[PDB]
Amino acid sequence: MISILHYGYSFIMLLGALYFYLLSKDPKGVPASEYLIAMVIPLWSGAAYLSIALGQGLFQYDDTTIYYARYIDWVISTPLLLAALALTAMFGGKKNLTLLFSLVALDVFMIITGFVADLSIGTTKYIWYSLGVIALIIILVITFGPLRRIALSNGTRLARHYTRVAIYLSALWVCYPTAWLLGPSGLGLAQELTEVLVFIILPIFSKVGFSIVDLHGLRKLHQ
Amino acid sequence: MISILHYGYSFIMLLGALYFYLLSKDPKGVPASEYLIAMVIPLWSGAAYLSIALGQGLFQTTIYYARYIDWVISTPLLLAALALTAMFGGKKNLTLLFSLVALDVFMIITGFVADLSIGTTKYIWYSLGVIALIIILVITFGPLRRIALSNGTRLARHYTRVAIYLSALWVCYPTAWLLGPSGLGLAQELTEVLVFIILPIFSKVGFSIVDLHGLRKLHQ
Amino acid sequence: MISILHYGYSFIMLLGALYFYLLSKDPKGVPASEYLIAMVIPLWSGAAYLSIALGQGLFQYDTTIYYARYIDWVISTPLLLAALALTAMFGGKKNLTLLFSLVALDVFMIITGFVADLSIGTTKYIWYSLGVIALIIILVITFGPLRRIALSNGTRLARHYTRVAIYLSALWVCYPTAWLLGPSGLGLAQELTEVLVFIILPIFSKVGFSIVDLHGLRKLHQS
Ligand SMILES: CCCCCCCC/C=C\CCCCCCCC(=O)O
């Protein structure tokens, strides 16, 4: 079942990527860079999850299954999602690439702490987990603080769209470390199959859902 | 023999890099960035192949993993060089350039995974890499060539020449891969080793000689 | 002792990062990019050294390889070179080609060090030698074309650049010297001696350099 779920996921990612490509052909004032980002996220995630489906992107460690292909996915897909969110805030205004790369750095560090934590045991696991959560809190502070202020500097209509996609992505963000901690990688309260389903369903909303909401909202700003 | 061939290759890469550096000192209207790219490609490939020569960049089928360490850097830089040639004298399309870089890096990764794989799984990964290569070729002879044409007859003629040159070499790599020990195992290991010594001399040094000379000629 | 030394180091890195953050809040004409770089360097080094403290970022190869040092340097050292290059270019046009030339040389340098550490006999010293050649080219760029950019940006900037260039260059040569003398090379110096050198040096490079660099740039500010 776990294999089939991953095959299904990869197919949905492919469909998402194709939809964003078709959108890119009639771009409605959205720069090509934002369509490229929207396409790379699902294609990369799709490839990583295909490796799990084929039984390659996982291995046994501490008598538990480590789905290491998830970290290979997130270390690329999640910084790109934050870049998409940052470019939305900056839409129709001057870019702040310093703030964008601040978020990329925090996010890549966050995913790495997750991988190291998964490879760790006892207090060490929760030291790495904690550093990742601290990174996420700083990302959320940037998202609803200075990044939102950039969005507001680009007018009421843009800021309204940014706030919507910021809430959407932020809601999903907090789910990942919650599931991680509850599941076999952490406290082991939640069953492996439950965790597998969460990390199939959540990413459909993040890897495809977010960019549908994001691109449609930006496209609507076009006359 | 395999060790000696790799030492020889690394020396040719060094000579190529030095030639491009000398060219960079009298640049003839070609930006320093294009000389930097031309120098990094052979130096990186040279280092990777030196690791094979020293018997480090392989594990034993024999997987020459140092080839993938090479290509994951050298091949995106070659595509960047080709994209900047198309855009020479005009506005840059960095989105299209990074599209090619992304496709190419993915392509090399599928090759490494395919090499580590067995049976149907190997050819699934190989096929994804081939699909990436086809999209790269479509971009090269489609939208990227259209950018070249927008930059005048002389530039477009040069771009078309280097595009055919690189494209000819591109298709050879996955062909040799599939025929050799990593794939169907029809070609002998020594034959594959010689192909992946000779091809790269034309790609890592040959391409940039043709590319830089053609761009420099536009200064006159 | 080795574990405790690494814990202490990581805490100093955190303090350094916080100092740079506080400086960034009253930036005195220094772009946000230079504060971001100054903060990432110690935070990344801190995380890497924390992994050694926890007994994760090293392994036996008979001899101990502190591989987390290379994970540190492959990010921290190109960022230090970027900091130095942006100092030269302060108040003037950026040369990102020269900056990325230095990044490329430096990343190659650190990789040769890792491979050298994994190597034995003549092979070790071939890789070490290629790294030293990379370092010599970096020094030639630093005191040649990069210094000429600094000079083009006025007397006061050029004076500051020269000071931070000598500071970083002095530290640069110490690393491959300690490497060669210690267990990774000739094995003249004891493990504990090498460990202390690679605790003390980085405090001067990861925090010291940016204190001197940022203070010198901030001093150029009018008002
Ligand atoms: C965890 C390691 C990841 C580190 C990657 C990013 C490090 C930050 C380095 C440089 C920041 C680049 C800022 C670009 C400045 C452009 C001007 C602007 O728009 O602000």
Side-chain angles (χ1 to χ4, degrees), chain A residues 9 13 41 45 49 67 69-71 73-75 77-78 81 107 110-111 113-115 117-118 129 132-133 136 140 167-187 190 194-210:
Chain A
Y9 176 91
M13 290 302 105
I41 288 162
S45 190
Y49 271 53
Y67 292 89
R70 285 182 191 154
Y71 301 106
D73 180 353
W74 298 341
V75 80
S77 60
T78 62
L81 279 171
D107 179 289
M110 185 181 67
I111 302 307
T113 69
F115 179 55
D118 217 343
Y129 177 82
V133 170
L136 183 53
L140 282 173
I167 291 168
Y168 182 101
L169 190 55
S170 291
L172 292 171
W173 277 340
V174 300
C175 287
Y176 282 87
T178 300
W180 194 98
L181 183 58
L182 283 177
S185 293
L187 299 172
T194 300
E195 190 225 41
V196 160
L197 281 167
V198 167
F199 286 143
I200 287 287
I201 300 170
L202 279 184
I204 294 169
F205 285 95
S206 58
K207 302 311 187 307
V208 168
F210 169 84

Coordinates of all heavy atoms in Angstrom, one line a residue, chain A residues 9 13 41 45 49 67 69-71 73-75 77-78 81 107 110-111 113-115 117-118 129 132-133 136 140 167-187 190 194-210:
Chain A
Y9 N 1.1 9.5 -5.8 CA 1.6 10.9 -5.4 C 2.4 11.4 -6.6 O 2.1 12.6 -7.0 CB 2.4 10.8 -4.1 CG 3.1 12.1 -3.7 CD1 2.4 13.0 -2.9 CD2 4.3 12.4 -4.2 CE1 3.0 14.2 -2.5 CE2 4.9 13.6 -3.8 CZ 4.3 14.5 -3.0 OH 4.9 15.7 -2.6
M13 N 1.9 14.9 -8.8 CA 3.0 15.9 -8.9 C 3.2 16.2 -10.4 O 3.2 17.4 -10.8 CB 4.3 15.3 -8.4 CG 4.3 15.2 -6.8 SD 3.9 16.8 -6.0 CE 2.2 16.5 -5.5
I41 N 9.2 22.4 -8.0 CA 8.8 21.9 -6.7 C 8.1 20.5 -6.8 O 8.6 19.5 -6.3 CB 7.9 22.9 -6.0 CG1 8.7 24.2 -5.5 CG2 7.1 22.3 -4.8 CD1 7.8 25.4 -5.2
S45 N 9.8 16.7 -6.0 CA 9.1 15.9 -5.0 C 8.6 14.6 -5.6 O 8.9 13.5 -5.0 CB 7.9 16.7 -4.4 OG 7.4 16.1 -3.3
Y49 N 9.7 10.9 -4.3 CA 8.6 10.0 -3.8 C 8.6 8.7 -4.7 O 8.2 7.6 -4.2 CB 7.3 10.7 -3.8 CG 7.0 11.4 -2.4 CD1 8.0 12.2 -1.9 CD2 5.9 11.1 -1.7 CE1 7.8 12.8 -0.6 CE2 5.7 11.8 -0.5 CZ 6.6 12.6 0.1 OH 6.4 13.2 1.3
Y67 N 12.8 7.3 5.9 CA 12.4 7.7 4.5 C 13.2 8.9 4.1 O 12.7 10.0 4.0 CB 10.9 8.0 4.4 CG 10.0 6.8 4.6 CD1 9.6 6.4 5.9 CD2 9.5 6.1 3.5 CE1 8.7 5.3 6.1 CE2 8.7 5.0 3.7 CZ 8.3 4.6 5.0 OH 7.4 3.5 5.1
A69 N 14.5 9.9 1.5 CA 14.2 10.5 0.2 C 13.3 11.7 0.5 O 13.2 12.7 -0.3 CB 13.5 9.6 -0.7
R70 N 12.6 11.8 1.6 CA 11.7 12.9 2.1 C 12.6 14.1 2.3 O 12.2 15.2 1.9 CB 11.0 12.6 3.4 CG 9.8 11.6 3.2 CD 9.1 11.5 4.5 NE 8.1 10.4 4.5 CZ 7.8 9.7 5.6 NH1 8.3 10.0 6.7 NH2 6.8 8.7 5.5
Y71 N 13.8 13.9 2.9 CA 14.8 15.0 3.2 C 15.4 15.5 1.9 O 15.6 16.7 1.7 CB 15.8 14.5 4.3 CG 15.1 14.1 5.5 CD1 15.0 12.8 5.8 CD2 14.5 15.0 6.4 CE1 14.4 12.3 7.0 CE2 13.9 14.6 7.6 CZ 13.8 13.3 7.9 OH 13.2 12.8 9.0
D73 N 13.9 15.4 -1.0 CA 12.8 16.2 -1.5 C 12.8 17.6 -0.8 O 13.0 18.6 -1.6 CB 11.5 15.5 -1.2 CG 10.2 16.2 -1.6 OD1 10.3 17.4 -2.1 OD2 9.1 15.6 -1.5
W74 N 12.6 17.7 0.5 CA 12.3 18.9 1.2 C 13.5 19.9 1.1 O 13.2 21.2 1.1 CB 12.0 18.6 2.7 CG 10.8 17.8 2.9 CD1 9.8 17.6 1.9 CD2 10.4 17.0 4.0 NE1 8.8 16.8 2.5 CE2 9.2 16.4 3.7 CE3 11.0 16.8 5.3 CZ2 8.5 15.6 4.7 CZ3 10.3 16.0 6.2 CH2 9.1 15.4 5.9
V75 N 14.7 19.5 1.0 CA 15.9 20.4 1.1 C 15.9 21.3 -0.2 O 16.5 22.3 -0.2 CB 17.2 19.6 1.2 CG1 17.7 19.0 -0.1 CG2 18.3 20.5 1.8
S77 N 12.6 21.4 -2.4 CA 11.2 21.8 -2.6 C 10.8 22.9 -1.6 O 10.1 23.9 -2.0 CB 10.2 20.6 -2.5 OG 10.3 20.0 -1.2
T78 N 11.3 22.8 -0.3 CA 10.8 23.8 0.8 C 11.5 25.1 0.6 O 10.8 26.2 0.8 CB 10.9 23.2 2.2 OG1 12.3 22.9 2.5 CG2 10.1 21.9 2.3
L81 N 9.6 26.8 -2.2 CA 8.2 27.3 -1.7 C 8.4 28.6 -1.0 O 7.5 29.5 -1.2 CB 7.6 26.2 -0.8 CG 6.9 25.0 -1.5 CD1 6.5 24.0 -0.5 CD2 5.7 25.5 -2.3
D107 N 15.6 27.6 6.1 CA 14.8 26.4 5.7 C 15.7 25.2 5.4 O 15.4 24.1 5.9 CB 14.0 26.8 4.5 CG 13.1 25.7 4.0 OD1 13.7 24.7 3.4 OD2 11.9 25.7 4.2
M110 N 16.9 23.9 8.6 CA 15.8 23.2 9.2 C 15.7 21.8 8.7 O 15.6 20.9 9.6 CB 14.5 24.0 8.8 CG 13.2 23.4 9.5 SD 11.8 24.4 9.0 CE 11.6 23.9 7.3
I111 N 15.7 21.6 7.4 CA 15.5 20.2 6.8 C 16.7 19.3 7.3 O 16.5 18.2 7.6 CB 15.4 20.3 5.3 CG1 14.2 21.1 4.9 CG2 15.3 18.8 4.7 CD1 12.9 20.7 5.5
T113 N 18.6 19.6 10.0 CA 18.4 19.2 11.4 C 17.4 18.0 11.5 O 17.7 17.1 12.4 CB 18.0 20.4 12.3 OG1 16.6 20.7 12.0 CG2 18.9 21.6 12.2
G114 N 16.4 18.0 10.7 CA 15.4 16.9 10.6 C 16.1 15.6 10.2 O 15.8 14.6 10.9
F115 N 16.9 15.6 9.2 CA 17.7 14.4 8.7 C 18.6 13.9 9.8 O 18.5 12.7 10.2 CB 18.4 14.7 7.5 CG 19.2 13.6 6.9 CD1 18.6 12.4 6.6 CD2 20.6 13.7 6.7 CE1 19.3 11.3 6.1 CE2 21.3 12.6 6.2 CZ 20.7 11.4 5.9
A117 N 18.5 14.5 13.1 CA 17.6 14.1 14.2 C 17.1 12.7 13.9 O 17.1 11.9 14.9 CB 16.4 15.1 14.3
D118 N 16.7 12.4 12.7 CA 16.2 11.1 12.3 C 17.3 10.0 12.5 O 16.9 8.9 12.8 CB 15.6 11.1 10.9 CG 14.3 10.2 10.7 OD1 14.1 9.4 11.6 OD2 13.6 10.5 9.7
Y129 N 16.1 18.3 16.6 CA 14.7 18.6 16.3 C 14.4 20.1 16.8 O 13.8 20.8 16.0 CB 13.8 17.6 17.0 CG 12.3 17.9 16.9 CD1 11.6 17.5 15.7 CD2 11.6 18.6 17.9 CE1 10.3 17.8 15.6 CE2 10.3 18.9 17.7 CZ 9.6 18.5 16.6 OH 8.3 18.8 16.5
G132 N 15.8 22.8 14.6 CA 14.9 22.9 13.4 C 13.7 23.7 13.7 O 13.3 24.6 12.9
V133 N 13.0 23.5 14.9 CA 11.8 24.2 15.3 C 12.1 25.7 15.5 O 11.3 26.5 15.1 CB 11.2 23.5 16.6 CG1 10.1 24.4 17.2 CG2 10.7 22.1 16.3
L136 N 12.2 27.2 12.2 CA 10.8 27.4 11.7 C 10.2 28.6 12.3 O 9.5 29.4 11.6 CB 10.0 26.1 12.0 CG 8.6 26.1 11.4 CD1 8.6 26.4 10.0 CD2 7.9 24.8 11.7
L140 N 8.6 31.9 10.5 CA 7.2 32.4 10.7 C 7.2 33.8 11.1 O 6.4 34.6 10.6 CB 6.6 31.5 11.8 CG 6.1 30.1 11.3 CD1 5.6 29.3 12.5 CD2 4.9 30.3 10.3
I167 N -0.8 32.4 5.2 CA -1.6 31.6 6.2 C -1.6 30.1 5.8 O -1.4 29.2 6.6 CB -3.0 32.2 6.5 CG1 -2.9 33.5 7.2 CG2 -3.9 31.2 7.2 CD1 -4.1 34.3 7.2
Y168 N -2.0 29.9 4.5 CA -2.1 28.6 3.8 C -0.8 27.8 4.1 O -0.9 26.7 4.6 CB -2.3 28.8 2.3 CG -2.5 27.5 1.5 CD1 -3.8 27.0 1.2 CD2 -1.4 26.7 1.1 CE1 -4.0 25.8 0.5 CE2 -1.6 25.6 0.4 CZ -2.9 25.1 0.1 OH -3.0 24.0 -0.6
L169 N 0.4 28.3 3.7 CA 1.7 27.6 3.8 C 2.1 27.4 5.2 O 2.5 26.3 5.5 CB 2.7 28.4 3.0 CG 4.0 27.7 2.8 CD1 3.8 26.4 2.1 CD2 5.0 28.5 2.0
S170 N 1.9 28.4 6.1 CA 2.2 28.4 7.5 C 1.5 27.3 8.2 O 2.1 26.6 9.1 CB 2.0 29.8 8.1 OG 2.9 30.8 7.6
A171 N 0.2 27.1 7.9 CA -0.7 26.1 8.5 C -0.1 24.7 8.2 O 0.0 23.9 9.1 CB -2.1 26.2 8.0
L172 N 0.4 24.5 6.9 CA 1.0 23.2 6.5 C 2.4 23.1 7.2 O 2.6 21.9 7.7 CB 1.1 23.2 5.0 CG -0.2 23.2 4.2 CD1 0.0 23.4 2.7 CD2 -0.9 21.8 4.5
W173 N 3.2 24.1 7.2 CA 4.5 24.1 7.8 C 4.5 23.4 9.2 O 5.2 22.5 9.4 CB 5.1 25.5 8.0 CG 5.7 26.1 6.8 CD1 6.2 25.5 5.7 CD2 6.0 27.5 6.5 NE1 6.7 26.4 4.8 CE2 6.6 27.6 5.3 CE3 5.7 28.7 7.3 CZ2 7.0 28.9 4.8 CZ3 6.1 29.9 6.7 CH2 6.7 30.0 5.5
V174 N 3.6 23.9 10.1 CA 3.6 23.5 11.5 C 3.2 22.0 11.6 O 3.6 21.4 12.6 CB 2.7 24.4 12.3 CG1 3.1 25.9 12.3 CG2 1.2 24.3 11.9
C175 N 2.4 21.5 10.6 CA 2.0 20.1 10.6 C 3.2 19.1 10.5 O 3.1 18.0 11.1 CB 1.0 19.8 9.4 SG -0.6 20.6 9.7
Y176 N 4.2 19.5 9.7 CA 5.3 18.6 9.4 C 6.1 18.2 10.6 O 6.2 17.0 10.9 CB 6.2 19.2 8.3 CG 5.6 19.1 6.9 CD1 4.7 20.0 6.4 CD2 5.9 18.0 6.1 CE1 4.2 19.9 5.2 CE2 5.4 17.9 4.8 CZ 4.5 18.9 4.4 OH 3.9 18.7 3.1
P177 N 6.6 19.2 11.4 CA 7.3 18.8 12.7 C 6.4 18.2 13.7 O 7.0 17.5 14.6 CB 7.9 20.2 13.2 CG 6.9 21.2 12.5 CD 6.5 20.6 11.2
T178 N 5.1 18.5 13.7 CA 4.1 17.9 14.6 C 4.0 16.4 14.3 O 4.2 15.6 15.2 CB 2.8 18.6 14.5 OG1 3.0 20.0 14.8 CG2 1.7 18.0 15.4
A179 N 3.8 16.0 13.0 CA 3.7 14.6 12.6 C 5.0 13.9 12.8 O 5.0 12.7 13.3 CB 3.4 14.6 11.1
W180 N 6.2 14.6 12.5 CA 7.5 14.0 12.7 C 7.7 13.6 14.2 O 8.0 12.4 14.4 CB 8.6 15.1 12.4 CG 10.0 14.5 12.2 CD1 10.6 14.2 11.1 CD2 10.9 14.3 13.3 NE1 11.9 13.8 11.4 CE2 12.1 13.8 12.7 CE3 10.8 14.4 14.7 CZ2 13.2 13.4 13.5 CZ3 12.0 14.1 15.4 CH2 13.1 13.6 14.8
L181 N 7.4 14.5 15.1 CA 7.6 14.2 16.6 C 6.6 13.1 17.1 O 7.1 12.4 18.0 CB 7.3 15.6 17.3 CG 7.5 15.5 18.8 CD1 8.9 15.1 19.2 CD2 7.2 16.8 19.5
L182 N 5.4 13.1 16.6 CA 4.4 12.1 17.0 C 4.7 10.7 16.5 O 4.3 9.7 17.1 CB 3.0 12.6 16.5 CG 2.4 13.7 17.4 CD1 1.1 14.2 16.7 CD2 2.2 13.3 18.8
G183 N 5.4 10.6 15.3 CA 5.5 9.4 14.5 C 6.8 8.6 14.9 O 7.4 9.0 15.9
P184 N 7.1 7.6 14.2 CA 8.3 6.7 14.5 C 9.6 7.4 14.6 O 10.4 6.9 15.4 CB 8.3 5.7 13.3 CG 6.9 5.7 12.8 CD 6.4 7.1 13.0
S185 N 9.8 8.5 14.0 CA 11.1 9.3 14.0 C 11.2 10.0 15.4 O 12.4 10.3 15.8 CB 11.1 10.4 12.9 OG 11.2 9.7 11.6
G186 N 10.1 10.2 16.1 CA 10.1 10.9 17.4 C 9.6 10.0 18.5 O 10.3 9.0 18.8
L187 N 8.5 10.4 19.1 CA 7.9 9.7 20.3 C 7.4 8.4 20.0 O 7.3 7.5 20.9 CB 6.9 10.7 20.9 CG 7.4 12.0 21.3 CD1 6.2 12.9 21.7 CD2 8.4 11.9 22.5
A190 N 2.2 7.7 17.0 CA 1.5 7.5 15.7 C 2.1 6.3 15.0 O 3.3 6.3 15.0 CB 1.5 8.8 14.9
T194 N 0.1 5.6 9.4 CA -0.6 6.9 9.7 C 0.4 8.1 9.2 O -0.1 9.0 8.5 CB -1.0 7.1 11.1 OG1 -1.9 6.0 11.4 CG2 -1.6 8.4 11.4
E195 N 1.6 8.0 9.6 CA 2.7 9.0 9.3 C 2.8 9.0 7.7 O 2.8 10.1 7.2 CB 4.0 8.6 9.9 CG 5.1 9.7 9.8 CD 6.4 9.2 9.4 OE1 6.5 8.3 8.6 OE2 7.4 9.7 10.0
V196 N 2.9 7.8 7.1 CA 3.1 7.7 5.6 C 1.9 8.5 4.9 O 2.2 9.2 4.0 CB 3.1 6.2 5.2 CG1 2.8 6.1 3.7 CG2 4.4 5.6 5.5
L197 N 0.7 8.3 5.4 CA -0.5 8.9 4.8 C -0.5 10.4 4.9 O -0.8 11.2 4.0 CB -1.8 8.3 5.4 CG -2.2 6.9 4.9 CD1 -3.2 6.3 5.8 CD2 -2.7 7.0 3.4
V198 N -0.1 10.9 6.1 CA 0.1 12.4 6.4 C 1.1 13.0 5.5 O 0.8 14.1 4.9 CB 0.5 12.6 7.9 CG1 1.0 14.0 8.2 CG2 -0.6 12.2 8.9
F199 N 2.2 12.3 5.2 CA 3.4 12.8 4.4 C 3.1 12.4 2.9 O 4.0 12.7 2.1 CB 4.7 12.3 4.9 CG 5.2 12.9 6.2 CD1 5.9 12.2 7.1 CD2 5.0 14.3 6.4 CE1 6.3 12.8 8.3 CE2 5.4 14.9 7.6 CZ 6.1 14.2 8.5
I200 N 1.9 12.0 2.6 CA 1.4 11.8 1.2 C 0.4 13.0 1.0 O 0.5 13.6 -0.1 CB 0.8 10.5 0.9 CG1 1.9 9.4 0.8 CG2 -0.1 10.5 -0.3 CD1 2.7 9.4 -0.5
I201 N -0.5 13.2 1.9 CA -1.6 14.1 1.8 C -1.2 15.6 1.9 O -1.5 16.4 1.1 CB -2.8 13.8 2.7 CG1 -3.3 12.4 2.5 CG2 -3.9 14.8 2.6 CD1 -4.3 11.9 3.5
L202 N -0.4 15.9 3.0 CA 0.1 17.3 3.3 C 0.8 17.8 2.0 O 0.5 18.9 1.6 CB 1.1 17.2 4.5 CG 0.5 17.2 5.9 CD1 1.6 17.2 6.9 CD2 -0.5 18.3 6.1
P203 N 1.8 17.1 1.5 CA 2.6 17.6 0.4 C 1.8 17.9 -0.9 O 2.2 18.7 -1.7 CB 3.6 16.5 0.1 CG 3.6 15.6 1.3 CD 2.2 15.8 1.9
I204 N 0.7 17.2 -1.1 CA -0.2 17.5 -2.3 C -0.8 18.9 -2.1 O -0.9 19.6 -3.2 CB -1.4 16.5 -2.4 CG1 -0.9 15.1 -2.7 CG2 -2.4 16.9 -3.4 CD1 -1.9 14.0 -2.5
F205 N -1.0 19.4 -0.9 CA -1.5 20.7 -0.6 C -0.4 21.8 -0.7 O -0.7 22.9 -1.1 CB -2.2 20.7 0.7 CG -3.6 20.1 0.7 CD1 -3.8 18.8 1.1 CD2 -4.7 20.8 0.3 CE1 -5.0 18.2 1.0 CE2 -6.0 20.2 0.3 CZ -6.1 18.9 0.6
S206 N 0.8 21.3 -0.4 CA 2.0 22.2 -0.4 C 2.7 22.3 -1.7 O 3.0 23.4 -2.2 CB 3.0 21.8 0.7 OG 3.4 20.4 0.5
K207 N 2.9 21.1 -2.4 CA 3.6 21.0 -3.6 C 2.8 21.4 -4.8 O 3.4 21.9 -5.8 CB 4.2 19.6 -3.8 CG 5.1 19.1 -2.7 CD 6.2 20.1 -2.2 CE 7.2 19.5 -1.2 NZ 6.5 18.9 -0.1
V208 N 1.5 21.3 -4.7 CA 0.6 21.6 -5.9 C -0.4 22.7 -5.4 O -0.5 23.7 -6.1 CB -0.1 20.4 -6.4 CG1 -1.2 20.8 -7.4 CG2 0.9 19.4 -7.1
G209 N -1.1 22.4 -4.3 CA -2.2 23.3 -3.8 C -1.7 24.8 -3.6 O -2.3 25.7 -4.2
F210 N -0.5 25.0 -3.0 CA 0.0 26.3 -2.7 C 0.2 27.1 -4.0 O -0.2 28.3 -4.0 CB 1.4 26.3 -1.9 CG 2.1 27.6 -1.9 CD1 1.7 28.5 -0.9 CD2 3.0 28.0 -2.8 CE1 2.4 29.7 -0.8 CE2 3.6 29.2 -2.7 CZ 3.3 30.1 -1.7

